[PDB]
């Protein structure tokens, strides 16, 4: 029990939520835990900054949609959180693996 069961709710919010980005103000509210209700968790349970963990989660989620043989490549990053194609093109810094070649795999 950390901050009255915030771990059991963060995962549910990440699962249920739409492609809306996750920031301090966005998740600070209906979360039931403010900035410090999340800082301790991100420091202890995860040990990684939000901008990298969210990007990794989006990449792991899109790894299946890229294999689902979808022709609308521009909408793949949009349906998962990346509001722009250039920002998602994160993939170069993470995998150094072609968008298209991976999409071909």
């Amino acid at each position: 029990t950390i901050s009255a069961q915030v771990i059991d709710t963060i995962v549910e919010w990440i699962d249920d939520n739409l492609h809306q980005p996750l920031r301090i103000d966005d998740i600070a509210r209906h979360a039931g835990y403010s900035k410090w209700h999340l800082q301790r968790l991100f420091l202890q349970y995860k040990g990684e900054s939000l901008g990298r963990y969210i990007r990794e989660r989006k990449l792991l989620l899109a790894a299946r949609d890229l294999r689902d043989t979808d022709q609308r490549v521009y909408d793949i990053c949009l349906k998962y959180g990346f509001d722009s194609q250039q920002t998602f093109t994160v993939f170069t810094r993470t995998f150094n693996q072609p968008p298209g070649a991976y999409r071909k795999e």
């Binding site: 509210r29 209906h30 979360a31 039931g32 403010s34």
Partner: protein, 48 residues
């Protein structure tokens, strides 16, 4: 999401969440007091 669920829950545990911008107590009193509903009455059947 129901009026029967809103009238039954006690405000002592309802007003402690920090995510509510405002509970709209004006409309809450308008829907409970003007319709003959006091603090925590058990209705016959609230859910559809």
């Amino acid at each position: 999401h129901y009026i029967g669920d809103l009238v039954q829950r006690t405000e002592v545990e309802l007003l402690k969440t920090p995510n509510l911008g405002k509970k709209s107590l004006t409309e809450i009193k308008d829907v409970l007091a003007s319709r003959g509903l006091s603090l925590g009455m058990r209705l016959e059947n609230w859910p559809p």
